[PDB]
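Can you give me the bound-state structure? Components:
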Amino acid sequence: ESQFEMDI
Amino acid sequence: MKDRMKTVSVALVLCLNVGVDPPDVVKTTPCARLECWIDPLSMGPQKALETIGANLQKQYENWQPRARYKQSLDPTVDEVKKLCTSLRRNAKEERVLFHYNGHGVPRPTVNGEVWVFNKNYTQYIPLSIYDLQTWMGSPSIFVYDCSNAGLIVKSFKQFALQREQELEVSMKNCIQLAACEATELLPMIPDLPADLFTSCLTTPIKIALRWFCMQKCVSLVPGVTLDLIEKIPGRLNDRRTPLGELNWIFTAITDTIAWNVLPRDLFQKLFRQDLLVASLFRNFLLAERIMRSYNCTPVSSPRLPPTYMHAMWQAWDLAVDICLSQLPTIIEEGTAFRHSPFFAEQLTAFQVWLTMGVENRNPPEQLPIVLQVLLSQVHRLRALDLLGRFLDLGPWAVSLALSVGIFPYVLKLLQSSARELRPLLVFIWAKILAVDSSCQADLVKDNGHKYFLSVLADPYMPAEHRTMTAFILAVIVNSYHTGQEACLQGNLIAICLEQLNDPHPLLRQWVAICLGRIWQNFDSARWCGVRDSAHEKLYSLLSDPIPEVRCAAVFALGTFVGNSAERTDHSTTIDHN
Amino acid sequence: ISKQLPQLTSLELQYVSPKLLMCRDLELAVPGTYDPNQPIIRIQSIAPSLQVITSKQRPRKLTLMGSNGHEFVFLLKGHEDLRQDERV
Amino acid sequence: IEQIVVALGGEFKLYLPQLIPHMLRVFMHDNSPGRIVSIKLLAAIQLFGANLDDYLHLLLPPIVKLFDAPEAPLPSRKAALETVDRLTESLDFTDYASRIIHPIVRTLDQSPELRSTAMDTLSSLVFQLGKKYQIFIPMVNKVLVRHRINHQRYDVLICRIVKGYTL
Ligand SMILES: [Mg+2]
Ligand SMILES: [Mg+2]
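Here's the bound-state model for the whole set.
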């Protein structure tokens, strides 16, 4: 999905 | 960005004929025949080839682990035709990447002739770029590590034109990356890898640090050399290690440069549509910077403006210098690794710009940095605050924020477990919806609407945020026509009815508007409306001293009855009253 | 295993014996010489890699550097009892 | 030196620091009839290219001083102008814009003999600077209008910069 990983 | 075409398969075609030097090779002392960090002479003609191929595979998997792998070692003619045909069959509409090495091949001709053969060098086999284009007629990306690589690109374009002319009785879909111009050769430098262009595109670090050590005229960090650079601990994706932080900074800088140099028409196509294309161009900028120093000029199609002159590269060198001054002791003593102030300073500069922003100014150059900061859990609160303050300017400020891709990230932050982020996400979404109400039901397809319902429910939240939340709910209910059921599942009507007695003029207006918008064409909340005698409370707002509240009450009440009357039945009593 | 051994042509000390690679003047005489009436030639360094010779059996070539700066070349071979050669 | 520079394509950077003192001394004390030695040096310098990345700030005083030295034979000043014009194609002269622009304006005023070449030099510098040259537009034009000075490329570049599109 997102181009970059998110530390949700 | 609805166009989400992706790369499905990668073809690795190697011509590393270990032990054979073409007749036009100048040899040998500075040859530095290091390929994929392998020296073929220590393993022999067969083990080395397979080992190098394995490393090339690993280097590509780091960027797109899901790609379909396809490899040929010294393929001739039918082997390539069959490979390209099979890959086209695997995915006929998606992109294919074609990587040609050419180190063991004589300098290319206008036709692309290559030394592929049945283990007998006298069988050069002339090839045809035209035929290669025919086999791979799909959208595709080409990488050429040839010495006179630009010659191939020129022939490719001329053949594409020829084909188009024949069709008047692929040019616009191909992307090409060539190592250097048609009139120059790759450097023979004893300290560099032979596959310099590949290394820059596939391993952005490593050579970047090696170059740093070699290129710097006078080192300012005594004691740091290659013996330590090759011992730096950590995984590339482990955000808290030296290499992790360096990769994060590198990405942020290269995105900032692309944002601030290219026209938007190219930026969106190259750095957002496809993960692999964006990664390759991001690394290409580094390859340009490094190869310039050796009298080589990398060539690409589409052509980009030059970037080696940009000021941001100085920031990179500074960050690298700071990191490396800690490396000795960390290795020798084990001292804890300290993080750089890079992002803190970039946020500070943004904050300074915000002091007095106007439309008639260059946009801030650091929005791509804020986008990166929002991905972590250290400075998230500050980045969100500064973003909010930026968005408080007139609508133009919002459009810029939209053009970089805040939207798909704030949708993810919307469902985090944090509670302290409530007023910030509410403010940001209130402004985005106030400016761009066309969002294709993203807040009601996912669980974002539930978040805002809970936000409204919280009895201790200040009225300013309750008002913004009520606004957001009114917008998504009237805007999407799918939130119509969700607002009933959460008993939004009960909440609004309770909140009709709120002393604040705007909560009274927006709550009444929400109720009016709910009672439009709902069958379920035709019945819920009549069932709870909601109108009985709304008419009391007709006594409100402020005419804006009376208008909102008249709207909600008239809509309530106008739609409830569709049944008539016993509700005709209400209709007349 | 039988597929791979013919492809072995050399060994580097870093993968088989890092302790030798890191030497150091060891105060030991070069194995091939000692004369009580002359100065003792001390071992100064060991070549970074060994060359494997391919035959029915595989001896390895070693080179040592001595205190006099000369190269000394020895052939290292296992699977044989050399005490007979010494007596001869 | 020229032959070595051509042979040592990307390696000359490791040896250049040991020759700079001699080139500088030649520029300071050129006693040839009248400046043929320094002219030969200028011809050699034009081929260095990227090798001057970290040394441009050392070799671009005396060229300008020669340019601003109205005693030397005319071919020397023209050679200095051509040298800077060619160097502009490969090196970043952003930080030296004020250093270069001021001497040229004086030359434009002082004598028509170097007028044509000087205008060509401006065209190359402005091209590289682009919008960065906007801060200098009013001053140079003020001098240009004193004399019958025009140029197809300078005038087009300035009009494009003012309009806001230079591509
Ligand atoms: Mg035997
Ligand atoms: Mg033996």
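A couple of observations. Chains D and A do not touch (no CB pair under 8 Å). The CA atoms of residues 97 and 165 of chain D lie 21 Å apart.
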